[PDB]
Amino acid sequence: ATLKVIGVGGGGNNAVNRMIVEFIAINTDGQALNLSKAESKIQIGEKLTRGLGAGANPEIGKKAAEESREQIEDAIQGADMVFVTSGMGGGTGTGAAPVVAKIAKEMGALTVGVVTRPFSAAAGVEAMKAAVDTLIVIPNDRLLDIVDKSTPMMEAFKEADNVLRQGVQGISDLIAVSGEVNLDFADVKTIMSNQGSALMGIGVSSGENRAVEAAKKAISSPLLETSIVGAQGVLMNITGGESLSLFEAQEAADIVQDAADEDVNMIFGTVINPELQDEIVVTVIATGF
Structure with missing residues (x-):
């Protein structure tokens, strides 16, 4: 690639x-x-x-x-x-x-x-x-x-590309966030389509705590934290190599599910890709604001 x-x-x-x-x-x-x-x-x-x-x-x-x-x-x-x-x-x-x-x-x-x-x-x-x-x-x-992080990053963008083609949960427009960004929910609206816009938080981690670390990162930015609370829906994905356990996968799923509404419809997905090595990448897409 x-x-x-x-x-x-x-x-x-x-x-x-x-x-x-x-x-x-x-x-x-x-x-x-x-x-x-x-x-x-x-x-x-x-x-x-x-x-x-x-x-x-x-x-x-x-x-x-x-x-x-x-x-x-x-x-x-x-x-x-x-x-x-x-x-x-x-x-x-x-x-x-x-x-x-x-x-x-x-x-x-x-x-x-x-x-x-x-x-x-x-x-x-x-x-x-x-x-x-x-x-x-x-x-x-x-x-x-x-x-x-080019390899985990590219998996994230491929997912973002796929959501947008199939209009998953009605998403016609998307902006991704990585790390702690200076934007609140405004600054964003004026530049995004009014229905079916979405926000993708991305986080990437390796080593000891990698699963919980990566999930916390994907929701950590100001934009993601404020917007998961309201979200009508959430798409979450975690992708890891052959070493990614059901433990890691369930644990990261938990952390995200908690930040989200008790009533949110969450799509949850898990991918074992040998291309990633010890890296894991978590994407969180909130939509329906």
Whole structure:
């Protein structure tokens, strides 16, 4: 399963540098690509921006990516999964990144929008959400977990992709959360569809306490904790390797069931996947707010 991680504009180029599975750096400003450690580098919109001073316009970023679509395709060629981020800070990349997402999706890569940028900015987030399979919000200091935990992460996004295709429990729209994120239930509504939106908490753990640890993590964020209480329904999944016991599975199931309403309809699922080793991953999707 080939994963390709793509940072776009100033913030994504730094994100990718921090992270250095294959990496691609994309920028409308060619100068910044001289500071890139990524093996694959793409200047986008060279003809569009020729002679211009460097700029902050997202629309330029967007039109630059459409001009360069062909070169982006070749670089992404052969990816099963694509992470796209513009990282921190604003610029052309917030315009460019959703196009890069859309391009990958149409090559049939499962496509995750990764948002490290604080918001309630949202101009960009709204557009990324429109363009991607699943959108994940993760804190900037935690960015490394997406590439360290890439295997459990990808199982989480595959589940999120599957819920959305089959409209499970009526879910037409979804945002994933990992780690402790600065959003409350507002900041979220204004950017999400009004019926059948959902929230996916994700947590990943290894070693001694791994099952209870991972379940607590998936519900730990401000967004998940406030929204499990109201939830009309909850989809939970735990995925582990050959070593995942019924004990671990039942224990994690318990922890989630308690946070949820006594009257919630919970779907509970358990997967033994030898691909995971000693890692386990728990996903919690609340819906019906």
